């Protein structure tokens with residue numbers, strides 16, 4: 001399948017060297033991709049496309065949709081119930097939103113919790129090469145995205161906007177991040193099962 005080879009290529013090509021030296025997500029240059037499953041949840045898809053149409057109408061007939069990664073210990077709940085701002089990451093740089101990355105390795109830092117938590121449930125290892133991890137590769141409606149470089153604790157999108165884009169800056173972010181404040185603005189399209197690989 002070419003659709004899944006495209007997803008594997010985005011997963012592999014967006015890995016970056018992290019400033020924390022692998023503390024949160026583990027030490028690796030690449031992944032062993034085990035499975036890529038397309039999520040087909042009609043009710044969530046309709047909730048997503050309904051909101052996408054509304055955002056497009058409010059953003060010069062443009063949804064500003066992007067495919068982005070999301071890491072969480074709650075990926076199974078997300079696939080069944082959808083993203084939910086009532087469970088937003090309050091401690092985030094941009095406040096109470098749902099965070100996405102264009103770099104798979106940034107999302108990998110969140111798979112076992114904030115700052116990687118205590119790592120895998122079996123070995124309590126943030127750099128476990130044994131346990132299988134899951135990431136989501138999502139359709140995200142950004143609409144009119146508010147560009148921000150420094151911490152700005154929001155409860156909702158800035159007035160007239162549909163999302164926040166965190167841009168890299170000297171004093172701030174190493175890599176971009178994208179924040180929505182309404183769960184219906186993302187669809188968990190692909191579930192990726194993988195392992196991080198021990199460097200060569």
Ligand SMILES: O=c1[nH]c2sccc2c2ccccc12
Pocket residue numbers: 069070071072089092099100101106107108110177178
């Ligand atoms: O993929 C992400 N998952 C989660 S879960 C709590 C925070 C984040 C997060 C933060 C910045 C960029 C990506 C992510």
Ligand SMILES: [Zn+2]
Pocket residue numbers: 120121122123124125128129130131
């Ligand atoms: Zn493990």
